[PDB]
Amino acid sequence: SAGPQLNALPDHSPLLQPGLAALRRRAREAGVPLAPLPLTDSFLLRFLRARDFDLDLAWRLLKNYYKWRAECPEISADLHPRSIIGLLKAGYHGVLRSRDPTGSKVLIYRIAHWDPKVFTAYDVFRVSLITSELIVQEVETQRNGIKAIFDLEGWQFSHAFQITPSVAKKIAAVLTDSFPLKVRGIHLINEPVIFHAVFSMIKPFLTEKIKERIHMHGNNYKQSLLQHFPDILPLEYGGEEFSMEDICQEWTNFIMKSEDYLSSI
Ligand X SMILES: COCCOCCOCCOc1ccc(C(C)(C)CC(C)(C)C)cc1
**Applying CB under 6 A, which residues contact ligand X?**
107, 121, 124-125, 128, 131-132, 135, 146, 148, 150, 157, 160, 163, 168, 171, 174-175, 179, 181, 183, 186, 192, 194-195, 198-199, 214
Work out how close the CB of 173 gets to ligand X at its nearest, in angstroms, rounded to a whole number: 9
Q: How far is the CB of 143 from ligand X (least distance, A)?
A: 14
Return the number of the residue (16 or 262) whose C-beta is nearest ligand X: 262
Alpha-carbon gap, residue 119 to 126, rounded angstroms: 11
Q: Is 201 annotated as a binding residue?
A: yes
Task: Say if residue 123 carries a ligand binding annotation.
Answer: no
Residue 16 vs 109, nearer CB to ligand X: 109
HEC readout, the chain: CHHHHHHCCCCCCHHHHHHHHHHHHHHHHCCCCCCCCCCCHHHHHHHHHHCCCCHHHHHHHHHHHHHHHHHCHHHHCCCCHHHCHHHHHCCCEEECCCCCCCCCEEEEEEHHHCCCCCCCHHHHHHHHHHHHHHHCCCHHHHHHCEEEEEECCCCCHHHHCCCCHHHHHHHHHHHHCCCCCCEEEEEEECCCHHHHHHHHHHHHHCCCCCHHHEEECCCCCHHHHHHHCCCCCCHHHCCCCCCHHHHHHHHHHHHHHCHHHHHCC
Taking the least distance from each CB to ligand X, the nearer of 16 and 44 is: 44
Residue 119 marked in a binding site: no
Is 209 part of any known ligand binding site? yes
Nearer to ligand X, 15 or 197 (CB): 197
Q: Is 28 annotated as a binding residue?
A: no
198 is in an annotated binding site: no
**Shortest distance in whole angstroms from residue 106 CB to ligand X:** 9
> Does 179 count as an annotated binding residue?
yes
Q: Name the minimum Å distance from CB 163 to ligand X.
A: 4
Is 182 marked within a binding site? yes
Nearer to ligand X, 23 or 177 (CB): 177
Q: How many CB atoms lie within 10 A of CB 265?
A: 16
From the CB of 188, what's the least distance to ligand X, in Å? Answer: 6
Least gap, CB of 18 to ligand X (angstroms):
28
Smallest separation (angstroms) from ligand X to the CB of 150:
5
Cα distance between residue 259 and residue 265, in whole Å: 10
* CA–CA distance, 174 with 53 (Å, rounded to integer): 19
Pick 20 or 96: Cβ nearer ligand X: 96
Compute the C-alpha angle 181/19/63, nearest 5°. 50
Q: Which is nearer to ligand X, 16 or 108 (CB)?
A: 108
CB 39 within 8 A of CB 24: yes
Numbered residues of the known binding site: 177, 179, 182-184, 200-203, 209, 213
Numbered residues of the known binding site for (+)-alpha-tocopherol: 179
